Symmetry: C3
Subunit: 456 residues, 3 copies
């Protein structure tokens, strides 16, 4: 169970509660990318240099096809087994493959028909001079085509049509080709060493197209709402289906799974405070996000997940375990909670939660302007609470604030709870501590062997 | 205290001493950003598409205003309490708020007059077609306006004025709008889930404007000197003051606090060396930067701070604590210092400090070309020192170097000091070690319970 | 030694074996960069503003020269010692210097002749209006010159030649200059606080030139093959040789060392699996990459290295040590291996290696469609193996797969091996555990002092 009162009295302030959702139904769509530049706009006087580019990309495209070769042949179906819905893998010659590799192979075997249809239609597609446009199909999936930055190359031909010779245009087109090749090598193409794994992020694709990804979502029919959460989660991934060395034809996957809310799922947000013990500033180590799910305490990492005031969805769902000490600290037990020292000049001395303020007067001033009696605090107090019964307007530091009324009798007063011993969090300090523990283990082993040698 | 001789004899070379400064007087300036495109340059034949954009940004701007709503109403002042300089908060209905949230609310309540003045002047500001310009006010703060990349859109209209139809211009302007929207979503706007927190960095603003930030600093009147240190520290932050859904009007904060030098503040720089014990290469684990302040040993993290040869300023001032073992190792005690093994082919065998060289001859060659006697070293030596008394020119590896004279009698010779046991620094090794310690804790608890059951 | 069978039976699947290479023969080439804008294209009516830029860069260039001053004077040679191939350093006045600083000083002393030749030829080089071109020399090294983005500035002068006044052109050129200055400050120039250290990466240089680096490699004569591995390793570094404050003349180093294959060098790739113990999912902690070298177990970090199916080369070659527990777990000992709990919805239940599948039927369904007997598994089984002797086609989850034949008699069956106790990997959990260990150390010390006080 979770005890909010215990966390409040320790020094941990509750934030906001969020829900948890799980992605499902991984529907996928294919996108076509052509490495060959468009035949319009660019003149043929530099096309010889283009031939060199045709070789250069080949040096990058020939091995990639070799990666795809001998892989699709390991999956087959229909050999007198049409009743089976799935396909029987024959990865004996493949040697080594993972679960992700097997799933990618199954997807490739399923989408081989679409890949062949796209390859057949490539002859007509190559004649499309439009910059960005949609593409119909057999009514199974809708495709699209984009001319990339090369479509803007014509915009650089209107100036100095005949003032600059063909050499300058060739140099400019070579510079543009080198820039595109460098961008592809940085965040596309052979960046993923294994093309049978779905690990392509939308950030790389955006960086290829000058940090833009809205066009693909609009073409595929995305949802305007919760766009920031989807972008932060990065649930959309991509993989290579087929590659054409001669034509520079590649296919990219776009997955838009639907989110389903987990019943009775709750995630808690907490923040620490800078309380006082004796003339010094102290803080408590507590994770900002706590996972509860269906009444089962667990740990979760929100570093690579979304942070929203109403929903928290993790793309990987690590679901890390939680130690017994952390569980005890979270529940109604304060002896298992650790504390650290803070020397920062600016600290969150006060905080607000559920209409109630939390701070300490051992280091910050406390005085009710409505009463002549100056508010004080005993030296053996860690935390304090304020209510409208004592005073209406309170002042912390140079900031005035007012609170409401307690939910019950309001007997919080200034109750304090003891905590565990402090310890350093620095990596070097942890290393020194564990080295000392290992050194003491020698004496421990010596005592153990002494207790079983002549101890009688 | 700090013992430089002990560090030198252990194997730690002193670098350079730096000062420490603290930011203060957080003066703030407001900057106005208009999401609506300029009325000049772009033709009206695509303005219908602009209307769709007017809806799209609304889907991103409507919730943000809801974030600002019901927040400023929680702070009020002047209700028969004009004598009070501050404002009395009424965050009872707010529910949960942090110290940063309270400070942001106070700042918003103070700057509401400026926000209202800016909103009133927006009618005249919208008629300003200038790309980048300044803006006067009531003589409290100076503002500015910038047309962003949209001002360059007109530069794309000079080519093909009538050769390309309105459809191409509309497509280009839509592509530009999508790129700007994607950039804003990446490094602006709703990236910060809580708009009542000052966590906007200048790097994001620069990425919005193609990695450029000098114009804002020049307009605000920054200081040319120490610009690199200010950029590295990132002391300038921003926050949202008000948002206009219809007009796309937003305000950004720019803080330029003044740095005050802490009296008697010193920060030390140290580097490790690759010494020898017996035919093997060994290194010592010591932090590169050591914080001393006003004669009080402490730990500091310079990863997110500045690194300058004359001053070190940390933006967050973590001021992490230091373990007793680290303090003992830093001072005149060598038994608390740990060592590790290094197998790298290239290592810093030699180093220079205060005109004195430090190296070991157990693995590197040592020979004075001015003397026929070949320099040697005993097998039980860890470190060695050289001086002009023995030879004038020394050779380490294939590099010749010369030193000066010692500060005193020069009796350093080849004194060595013992160190503690070694240990691995890898995370997996640390995990295995702590798992073994936990396993041994079972036997420890068994022995403890045996010692209190029948041990008599 | 390495036991692949032990790893397979524990739950660790072998991947692919790679080689290891070491860089050598660090040949270096110089590249010239001119900060002064080209005299062609830009009109003189804005040149006055350029003068201000001439001052601005000076504020950034004057200290840098001071960094180079008094440094080259500390290295000298030829003073009646021409027979010596090296140079004798005189860094007594330098005070503090590292091994990298000494190497950089030696390189500067060696290349001072080339630097002087470049400075002398700068007078003729400044008259070169070509965008990018090569540059001959004394036949020791080939240089090059590049006009950067400024060469495209003329492309912005063709539109509105006389429609826009000189003020607009000056504003545009000032904006471009500010953008270039910001980019330089971000990823060039004074970013490296110590200019006597080689720590400039090619990523920063590419970011200066819009993420492009192929032109420099093509000019210097790079190798088309293994380009991705070279880019990932980042073996090419740079350093500042000389700086001209007035002319904005700087030199950058480009190193292209040759890779030599280490004899009998092997690096192993491994992946974990999600096995079962009793109705729960469990995983094993094992590093993905294992270093073996010439029959010597060691640890290596591939995070900042290359990942290729045929070769793995580390730029820094950390060569971290390995704990005894990890060595025991890797070899034929399972008691030293640790395990963790995983609650993720999607886990790699099955895997393939050497034509053999590995999975568990305790949580996933197992049934041979060719036989009416349903495949089952005992509750006390952790891992299982499948072969063509029992069934030809196997099904895991909703995926069908087939295997070949065992290398020997095929008596793997479903043998299981015990593992060590589990432990949490979270940093907070580790901190709590070490705090508890430190607390127990107090009782341990009390028992130790009791055993030497009156224990008789």
């Amino acid at each position: 169970s979770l005890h909010y009162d215990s966390l409040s009295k320790v020094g941990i302030i509750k934030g906001l509660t969020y829900n948890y959702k799980i992605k499902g139904s991984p529907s996928t769509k294919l996108m076509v990318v052509k490495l060959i530049p468009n035949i319009d706009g660019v003149r043929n006087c530099t096309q010889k240099q283009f031939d060199e580019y045709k070789n250069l990309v080949k040096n990058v495209l020939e091995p990639v096809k070799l990666a795809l070769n001998a892989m699709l042949d390991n999956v087959k179906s229909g050999n007198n087994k049409y009743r089976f819905a799935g396909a029987i893998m024959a990865g004996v010659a493949l040697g080594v493959a993972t679960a992700a590799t097997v799933t990618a192979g199954i997807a490739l075997h399923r989408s081989n028909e679409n890949a062949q249809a796209i390859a057949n239609m490539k002859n007509a597609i190559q004649n499309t001079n439009e910059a960005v446009k949609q593409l119909q199909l057999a009514n199974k999936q809708t495709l699209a085509v984009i001319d990339t930055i090369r479509g803007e190359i014509n915009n650089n031909i209107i100036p100095v049509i005949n003032q600059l010779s063909c050499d300058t245009i060739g140099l400019s087109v070579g510079i543009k080709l080198t820039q595109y090749y460098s961008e592809i090598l940085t965040a596309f193409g052979p960046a993923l060493q294994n093309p049978v794994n779905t690990r392509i992020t939308i950030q790389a694709i955006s960086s290829v197209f000058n940090r833009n990804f809205d066009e693909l979502l609009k073409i595929m029919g995305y949802t305007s709402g919760d766009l920031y959460e989807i972008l932060h989660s990065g649930l959309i991934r991509g993989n290579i289906i087929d590659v054409d060395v001669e034509a520079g034809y590649i296919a990219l996957e776009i997955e838009f799974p639907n989110l389903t809310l987990v019943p009775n799922a709750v995630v808690q947000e907490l923040m620490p405070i800078s309380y006082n013990v004796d003339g010094d500033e102290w803080v408590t180590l507590v994770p900002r996000f706590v996972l509860t799910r269906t009444t089962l305490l667990s740990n979760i990492d929100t570093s690579r997940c979304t942070v929203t005031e109403s929903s928290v969805i993790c793309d990987n769902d690590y679901a890390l375990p939680m130690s017994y000490e952390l569980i005890g600290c979270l529940q109604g037990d304060t002896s298992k909670c650790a504390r650290e020292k803070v020397v920062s000049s600016y600290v969150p001395r006060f905080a607000l939660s559920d209409g109630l303020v939390y701070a300490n007067c051992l280091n910050t001033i406390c005085r009710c302007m409505d009463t002549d009696t100056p508010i004080s605090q005993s030296l053996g107090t860690t935390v304090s609470l304020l209510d409208n019964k004592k005073c209406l307007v309170y002042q912390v530091g140079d900031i005035l604030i007012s609170v409401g009324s307690y939910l019950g009798e309001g007997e919080y007063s200034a109750d304090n709870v003891e905590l565990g011993p402090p310890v350093v969090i620095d990596k070097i300090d942890i290393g020194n501590q564990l080295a000392g523990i290992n050194q003491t283990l020698q004496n421990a082993e010596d005592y153990i062997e002494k207790s079983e040698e002549f101890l009688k």
